[PDB]
Design a protein around this ligand. Sequence first.
Ligand SMILES: *C(=O)N1C[C@H](NOS(=O)(=O)O)CC[C@H]1C(N)=O
Length: 539
Amino acid sequence: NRIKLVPIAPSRGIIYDRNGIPLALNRTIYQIEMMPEKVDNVQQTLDALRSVVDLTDDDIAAFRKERARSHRFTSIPVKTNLTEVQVARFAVNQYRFPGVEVKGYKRRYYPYGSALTHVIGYVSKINDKDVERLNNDGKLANYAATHDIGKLGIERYYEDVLHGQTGYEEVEVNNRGRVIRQLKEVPPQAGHDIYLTLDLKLQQYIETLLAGSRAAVVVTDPRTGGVLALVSTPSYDPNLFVDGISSKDYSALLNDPNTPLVNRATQGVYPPASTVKPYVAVSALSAGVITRNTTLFDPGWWQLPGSEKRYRDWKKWGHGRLNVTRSLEESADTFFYQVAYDMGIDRLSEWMGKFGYGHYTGIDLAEERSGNMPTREWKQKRFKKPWYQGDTIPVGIGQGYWTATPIQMSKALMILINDGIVKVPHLLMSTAEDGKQVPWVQPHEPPVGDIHSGYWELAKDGMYGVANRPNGTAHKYFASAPYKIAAKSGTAQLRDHKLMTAFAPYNNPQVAVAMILENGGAGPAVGTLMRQILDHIML
Ligand SMILES: *C(=O)N1C[C@H](NOS(=O)(=O)O)CC[C@H]1C(N)=O
């Protein structure tokens, strides 16, 4: 009688929000299955199982077809999703059905569904590119009994910790290959539980605010860089994929022109526009090409020296006399056109790159785009034409070749809040299992510019003005708040993309928000939605 070794799959770790609410759970699902070769009389067995587990003609139909579409000595399921009564009935009848097995499979469950789709992700059936990627990473050995895998979001980024360590059992089998006894069991070890920085009730609220629009919101705590909410709408139900998604259901997702499969927060690539003016400002003050007192007269436009090329301000007849404070307050373009010209693309890209633009943020998701912070070398490689000085000008106001993601906006915003300290936006607070907590540790990111310098306060004071002073572009959204709001909006490029960044309270910022409504959103203005979000958080 031969002794077989049989892998035991591990139980997948739980994902919890910042308050211990489980966001990704396991459910056991029961089926009876058989290897027909190991079943003496298949027909007799099927018919007697009508009585025992309420086996139906359709169940048998599905059985024989799946029996065809399967390799020799494959275990064919006979009946799936058994009720507990049905398992108990089969259990007390097990001895009549040698070669029929009852088995439990842990499946993944997402209780809050579409509110956490892009950030949490889903696990679903392993396919051939999963196999390949596991075999390159040299992890395949540990999946001998594992059949699902993180496909995106946190479920994929942390697949390795969530999965656990496969175990194994020694079982005795008879002449016909049926297990009669278990000799030894070396149990698996559950994957680690992971605790996220997310606030689930804040994420559901924001998802409610965003209803109908193509939008992304990132909310962070700038004191820690944690992601309190990262939502992309429209979304979809991650539970659809867990037990295998309908191709009807799946083609409906891909064919949605509102592209709900896209994580807009990390893969949405847009011109950052005016939202960059605070960072361009800090950069110019540090570079020394402007001053707290630098002033220019804006007629509503700006002309490139040695050229008839004129760039426009949004105010048709100008903002009159502008310094950096007032330019941030009223989101003047002319001031920043000039700043860009003086900075030069070289210095300008180098500084904006230090705020994170054009680079991956370091967030712990695998779905991410880097956007584009243009350089001479990049323009050369991408178009084999050299850099012209008029290419620098729109970069001053976050346009031209410049594109960024809302998670990049977030990183940059937090740097400004922290006076050049670079905090990576992250979702993981800690790991666990087996009882030992490992906290998420910030990678070494050297600061931007200089901490002691007073330019950080200057640019932030301007954002306070945007939100609070009568000439600020966002006064109507934020002035009346008890806590002090600082903000900076932008408009990009069908209708225009509406962007808003903000943080609160201004004295001791507890929350940072970058958000964007594609083509203006479906209802409220982005400034109204920002107020409501900052209200919900601060009460
Ligand atoms: C920045 O994107 N801009 C300057 C100004 N911002 O106004 S908004 O934030 O209220 O949309 C006008 C739009 C835009 C520009 N450069 O035109």
